[PDB]
Design an enzyme around this catalytic site. Structure first.
Site, short mmCIF file in Angstrom:
data_model
loop_
_atom_site.label_atom_id
_atom_site.label_comp_id
_atom_site.label_asym_id
_atom_site.label_seq_id
_atom_site.Cartn_x
_atom_site.Cartn_y
_atom_site.Cartn_z
N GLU A 1 0.81 -1.21 0.00
CA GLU A 1 0.00 0.00 0.00
C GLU A 1 0.85 1.27 0.00
O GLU A 1 0.55 2.22 -0.73
CB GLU A 1 -0.96 0.00 1.19
CG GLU A 1 -2.08 -1.01 1.10
CD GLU A 1 -3.10 -0.69 0.01
OE1 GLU A 1 -3.04 0.43 -0.56
OE2 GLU A 1 -3.97 -1.56 -0.26
N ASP B 1 -12.41 8.56 -7.95
CA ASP B 1 -13.66 9.14 -7.49
C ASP B 1 -13.48 10.47 -6.77
O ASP B 1 -14.48 11.07 -6.37
CB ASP B 1 -14.47 8.14 -6.63
CG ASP B 1 -13.79 7.78 -5.31
OD1 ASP B 1 -12.70 8.33 -5.00
OD2 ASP B 1 -14.35 6.95 -4.56
N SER C 1 -11.75 10.88 -3.89
CA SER C 1 -11.21 10.60 -2.57
C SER C 1 -9.69 10.44 -2.65
O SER C 1 -9.10 10.43 -3.74
CB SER C 1 -11.85 9.33 -2.00
OG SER C 1 -11.52 8.18 -2.78
N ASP D 1 -6.30 8.29 -0.53
CA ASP D 1 -5.82 7.31 0.45
C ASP D 1 -4.61 7.87 1.19
O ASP D 1 -3.70 8.45 0.57
CB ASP D 1 -5.39 6.02 -0.25
CG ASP D 1 -6.56 5.20 -0.77
OD1 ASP D 1 -7.74 5.51 -0.53
OD2 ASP D 1 -6.26 4.19 -1.44
N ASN E 1 -8.85 5.38 3.19
CA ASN E 1 -9.56 6.12 2.15
C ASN E 1 -10.52 7.13 2.77
O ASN E 1 -11.39 6.77 3.57
CB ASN E 1 -10.32 5.09 1.31
CG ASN E 1 -10.87 5.65 0.02
OD1 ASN E 1 -11.08 6.85 -0.10
ND2 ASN E 1 -11.13 4.78 -0.94
#
Ligand code: CL
Ligand code: CL
Ligand code: CL
Ligand code: CL
Ligand code: CL
Ligand code: CL
Ligand code: CL
Ligand code: CL
Ligand code: CL
Ligand code: CL
Ligand code: CL
Ligand code: CL
Ligand code: CL
Ligand code: CL
Ligand code: CL
Ligand code: CL
Ligand code: CL
Ligand code: CL
Ligand code: CL
Ligand code: CL
Ligand code: CL
Ligand code: NA
Ligand code: NA
Ligand code: NA
Ligand code: NA
Ligand code: NA
Ligand code: RU
Ligand code: RU
Ligand code: RU
Length: 129
Positions: free
Chosen positions: A35, A48, A50, A52, A59
């Site tokens: 990640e 979208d 958003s 992370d 998120n």
């Protein structure tokens, strides 16, 4: 801060992630590796709108407030910037809520695609835990 592998394993274990919701420590280290590459400062924008945040790429669509994700939730009740700290406490506490929501670690796309079903114990090899 970019954690070392065993350094992160020890911090995650201190915070109770080893076997949390049945996920062994190596699952959590593997998820963080893919990640964020263990970088607490990592941020990545989603299509979208958003974003992370942090070592576990939490998120803003659901879990934290960044002020720029209209219609989103803040289920960890935290500013997203708190997930960028060198102290992993806030990220771990929020991750515990995420992994408890019904879908387990499948919430983390890199975990599903790169860790799930693999020899995750390799991620804690050599660590004094
Ligand atoms: Cl470094
Ligand atoms: Cl270093
Ligand atoms: Cl380095
Ligand atoms: Cl490392
Ligand atoms: Cl070391
Ligand atoms: Cl090392
Ligand atoms: Cl390394
Ligand atoms: Cl180094
Ligand atoms: Cl290491
Ligand atoms: Cl590594
Ligand atoms: Cl490495
Ligand atoms: Cl280390
Ligand atoms: Cl710690
Ligand atoms: Cl604990
Ligand atoms: Cl524990
Ligand atoms: Cl493990
Ligand atoms: Cl990255
Ligand atoms: Cl997330
Ligand atoms: Cl805000
Ligand atoms: Cl927002
Ligand atoms: Cl599960
Ligand atoms: Na633990
Ligand atoms: Na477990
Ligand atoms: Na993520
Ligand atoms: Na949000
Ligand atoms: Na090493
Ligand atoms: Ru380094
Ligand atoms: Ru090391
Ligand atoms: Ru490494």
């Amino acid at each position: 801060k970019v954690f070392g592998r065993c350094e992160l394993a020890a911090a995650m274990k201190r915070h109770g992630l080893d076997n949390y919701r049945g996920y062994s420590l190596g699952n959590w280290v593997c998820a963080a590796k893919f990640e964020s590459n263990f970088n607490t400062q990592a941020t990545n924008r989603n299509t979208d709108g958003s974003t992370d945040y942090g070592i576990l790429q939490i998120n803003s669509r659901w879990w934290c407030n960044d002020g720029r994700t209209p219609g989103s939730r803040n289920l960890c009740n935290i500013p997203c910037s708190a997930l960028l700290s060198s102290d992993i406490t806030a990220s771990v506490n929020c991750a515990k809520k995420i992994v408890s929501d019904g879908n387990g670690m499948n919430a983390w796309v890199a975990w599903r695609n790169r860790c799930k079903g693999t020899d995750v114990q390799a991620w804690i090899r050599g660590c004094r835990l």
